[PDB]
C-alpha cells in the first residue's frame, strides 16, 4: 500500500464495486470490495412462474386445513329458548 | 420392399457399451446422500469394522444404479429383512438401525472439544474481569 | 377445553393461509401482463382502473 | 325449464351485476365455469351466479347439485354477454363465483345479496 | 380362449361406451373414457369435476410431488394414451391436451345431463362431440402448421 | 306465492287486473309492477319519480 | 339543469332531459319556434336518461337509458312505440341514430348506435328491429370491441356511410366505421396521428370534413376523401 | 348500390387448409365454395 | 479477405467435383437408400433398379418411350453431364425439363421416384436443374419424398426465389402452405416461377388435378394477401400499386383465362380474377377487359362457373352497361334465364342482368 | 345407463392384461424347453399360443 500505483488498470475494475471511502459509502464502510452474495435481479417472467407455484402450494394447504378444520369442529360439537 | 427413407441428422457417452448398458447416473440429492454414506462408511461402523481407504477428490461415479438384494434360497430365515426392516434409502436404513445413540454421544463430545476455549470461555473470563 | 384450544389454533391456521391466498392472487394481479385494478399501493391507494382487459 | 329459482327481476339483476363489477375490481372473484367449480369444491364459495343464455343448459347444470350438497346461494340471470360484460372480460362468461373475505364492505354487500337470493327463495 | 375373451370383452365395452356417452366415445375413445370413469367412480362423479382436473386425472402422485416441492407441474393424465393428442409435438401436445380437456368436460356433462326424448338418434346425441372433434382437428392442423421462423439468407460470401 | 318484490323495502299497496292472467300492482317504492299470474313471472315495471312537492322522495 | 337536449332535423322540436332519474328517465318535447312544452316521455329504468335522438322525420324518437334500454316513441300517437334491450350492455352512456331507407314507420333511418359504459359499441338495423310489433331481444347486426374504456362520443355521417366513435379516458380513442359492412378502417388513425383525449366529433354537412376536439382546447380537421 | 366484401384470410386459407394438395374436392365445387364465401348476397 | 470472397463466389460456381472426398459426398447424396450404402453403390445395379421402375412407369403410361430412347439407355449409363459443351447441356436440360413435366403427375409412387433416383445419381439433376425440379415437387409439400429432396439439395444452389426453406433445411420438417404462400405474398417471384411452371404444364397439355388444385390455392391466397397489403389508403398509391400488381399477374392470368384445352386452369383463372374483382376496388375498364377475355375463352363445362364470374364482375362494376361482345356471347349462352335463376338463388345477379338488357 | 358394470369391466381389463402377459412369458418358458428359437424369433404371444397349438 505504499508502493501501489494509482493508474493501475484491470478488468475487475470493470466488474466489481469499489471500496471507496466513508465519503461516498457512509457509516457502513470498511474498505472491503464486496461482490454478490449470490442473488441477482431475477426478471419478471420467472417471478410469475414462482408466484403460480407458491399459489398452488398455499391453496392445497388450505384444502388440507379446511378438511381438518371441519372434522375438528364436528368433533367439537359432538363433545359439546331451545326447547318448546 | 424399397421405399423412401427418412433423413434424421438432427457429447460424452451415456450408456457404456462395454459394461452392458449402464446409464449415466442422474444427479438426485438422495443419491448424493447415499454416495456420501458409502464413502464415509468407515465412521458408520464405529469401532467394529474398518474399510479400504477409497480416496478420490470427487466421489460420484459416472455410472451407478440403485438396486435390491433379492433373495436367499439357501437361507432366508434371518438373512431376510422384515417388512418393517425394509427401507427406501440406505441412509434411512442406517438411520433406523440402532447405535445412533452412540453417534449422538460422540457428537456432543467432539462438539465440546471444539468449543474448548475459543470464544465463550473468553467471554466468561471477561465477565469475571468486569465484575 | 383441550379440543377448544385445538380448534382455536386450527382456525388461526385457516385464517392465515387464507390471507396468504389473497396475497398471492393480488400479486398475480399486480404483476399481470396488462393493466388490472386491485389492492392498494404501499401508500394505501386502492387501485381502480376502469379499463377492460382486451 | 330446469331454471327454477329464477331471478329475472331487473332491479335484482342490476344490483347483482353491480356487485359483480365490484368483485372484478376487488379481485375477490373467479371467472370461468371451471373456476367457479374450483371455488366451490375448494369451499371458498360465497355465492355462485350463472346466466340462462347457455347454448346447452346441461353444460352448467352440474353445479347446483354441488351447491345443494355444500349449502351455498346461487342464481340464474339472463345473458352471457351481460355476465361477461359486467365482469369486464369482453367475452361470453356463463359462470362467475364471488368469494367471501375476512372483512369487507364488499363482504357486507355479498351478505346482503345472498339475503336477497334467500328472499327469492 | 382368454385372449378371445378379452377381445370380445373389448367389443362389449365398445358397445357399452357408445351406449353410455356418445359425445365421449365419439370424441376421445371408448377405452379412454373407460379409464376416466374408472378413476371417477361414477359418471355424475366425473361430471362434478372441472376440466383442468380432468386433464390431471390419474397422475396425482406426480401432481402432489410437484405441488409439495414447487417443481414444474405435470402436463396431463390418461389423455396421453388417448389418441387425439398422439399426433402433435411437445408444446403442441400440451396445448391440444388442455383444450381437449375443456371439450371433454363439456361433452361429459352433456352426456350425463342432457335429456333426450328417447326417439333421439345417436348422431343427434353426439353432435356435440362431433363439433368438438372437427374444431379440435382444425386446431391441431393450424397449431402444427405454424409457419417456421425465417432468417437472413446468405450468399456464399455471406451476402 | 306468485312472486315477492326483490327489494325488502317495497310495500304492495294497490291491486288490479288488466287481463285474466295479467296483474298490475302499485307499490310503495314508486313502482307499478306488472306480473303474469300463470308462472308468477314479471312482465314489466313502471316508475314514478320523486315528489317534486318537496321531500319524502318515495312516491 | 338544461344540460342535454336535441333539436329535430326539421328544426321543429327540442327535447330536454330531466333531473329526476329515480327509476326511469323522462324528458320534455318543446315546440321550438314557440319555445313551449308540448309533450313528455318517461321510461322505467334505473338511473334516468343516457342519450336520445329523433328519427329522420322528426316525428318520433328514441331514448336510451342506463342498463341499455332503448325506447321508440312517436308523436302522432304521442306515446312510446316500444322497448328493446341493447344486447348485453350492462349500462349505456351514448346513443345516436342515423340512416336512410329504414323503416319509415319508425322514421326511415337505417342504423342505431349504442355505446355502453363498459366500452362496447352495439350497432343495429331498425328494419331488423321489426317483428307494429317490436323484438324485445333483438340481435346484433354488429358488435364492436375495439376500444377498452367507455366510448365517449359517437356520431353518424349525414349520408349514412361512416360512423365515428371514441373514448376520452385513453389517449386518442377514436375509430371509424363503414356502413353497411360495419367494420373498422384499419389504416387510420396512427399512434402519431395527433388527435388528443377526444371530446367532440362532427361530420360536415356535405360529409367531406371531419372535425374533432380533445379536452385541451385544440380542434383539428380532416378531409374524408372517398 | 354495392361495395367490396371484407373476408378473413384465415377463412380463405383454412378453406384450402381442410386437406392436402392432392385428395381434394373437384375444382368446380371448390370454386363454388370460394365464390359462396365471396357472395355479397344477404 | 477480398480474394477470399471472390474465390468463394467461384466455389459456389463450381460444379464438377475435383477432390476425392467431395466426389464421394456428391456421389453418395441420394434419395432411396442411405448414404452408407450409396457410397458403395455403383451405377450398374442402380441402373437395374431404376430401369425396373422405369419399365413399370412406361407400362403405366405410354409417353415415356421417348426417354426410353434418349434418357434411359445403356448409353445413359455412361454419359457424364460434366464432360460436354454448353449446347449439348442445354439440349440435355430441355430433355430433363420435358421429362419432369411428363412425370409430374404420377409423383407419389415408387417406380417414378426410382426414375428420380436415376435422375439424381446419374445426371446430378438436384444440382443442375434445381429450379424446375424444386417447382415440380413443390406441390407435394407434406410428403417424405419431398422431405428427402430437401435433405439432399445443395443450399447455395437453391434459387433466390426458393431460398425460403432455409429454416427447414436447418431443421428437417415438411414446411406448410402458410409458409409458402407468405413468401408468395411478400415475395412475388416465387409466384412468378410457379406460375411459369404450371402454365408450361398446361401448354404441354400435361396438367393434372393435384397440380391445378395446388396452383389454385396458391394464386388465390397469394393475390388475396397481395391486395391485403396493397390497400394503402393513399389514392394514387393504391392506383399505382394495382398497376404494378396487374403487370405481375398479366401474362399468367391471360394465358389461364383463355387456356382453351384445360378447363381446370380456366376455373382457377376464374377464381383469381374473381377475387381480384370482388376484393380490390378495380377500375371499370380493367374489369370489363377481364370480362372480355373470359367471354373470349370459356367452354361449356366451364360455362356455369364463368357465369358466376360475370355475376361477380358486373356486380362489382360501377357503370350500368356492358361492352358488346360480352352481350354477343351471352346471347350465345344456351340456358340463360334458367342458369341465371339458379345462380341468383345465392349470388345477386342484378347488375349483370341490367347491363345485359342495356346492351 | 349404469356404471357398476363399467367399473368392474375395466378392472377385468386390467387384471386380464396382467395375467395374460404372465401366462405369455410362462408358456414361452414352457415350450422354450422344447423349442427356444420360437421365443427368440417370434415375440408376439397370441401368435405364440397359435403356433404351439
TrEMBL record, chain E:
Coiled-coil parts of chain: none
Q: Where is the Nop domain?
A: 20-145
Give its localization. Nucleus, Nucleolus
Highest rank taxon of the organism:
Eukaryota
Report the sequence similarity comment from the record.
Belongs to the NOP5/NOP56 family.
Function, as annotated, reads: Required for pre-18S rRNA processing. May bind microtubules.
Protein's name according to its UniProt entry: Nucleolar protein 58
What organism is listed for this UniProt entry? Chaetomium thermophilum (strain DSM 1495 / CBS 144.50 / IMI 039719) (Thermochaetoides thermophila)
**Covered residues of the complete protein?**
266 to 424 of 582
TrEMBL record, chain F:
Say which domain of life the source belongs to: Eukaryota
Instruction: Return the protein name.
Output: Uncharacterized protein
Origin organism is Chaetomium thermophilum (strain DSM 1495 / CBS 144.50 / IMI 039719)
Automatic annotation (TrEMBL), chain H:
- From which organism does this entry originate? Chaetomium thermophilum (strain DSM 1495 / CBS 144.50 / IMI 039719)
- Places the protein is found: Nucleus, Nucleolus
What is the name of this protein? Uncharacterized protein
Domain of life of the source: Eukaryota
From TrEMBL, chain I:
Listed transmembrane segments: none
Superkingdom to which the source organism belongs = Eukaryota
Enumerate the subcellular locations listed in this protein's record, separating them with semicolons. Nucleus, Nucleolus
Quaternary structure, from the entry: Component of the ribosomal small subunit (SSU) processome.
Per the similarity annotation, which family is this? Belongs to the HEATR1/UTP10 family.
Q: What does this protein do?
A: Involved in nucleolar processing of pre-18S ribosomal RNA. Involved in ribosome biosynthesis.
Instruction: Provide the protein name.
Output: U3 small nucleolar RNA-associated protein 10
Q: Which organism is it from?
A: Chaetomium thermophilum (strain DSM 1495 / CBS 144.50 / IMI 039719) (Thermochaetoides thermophila)
- Of the parent protein, the shown chain spans 3 to 361 of 1802
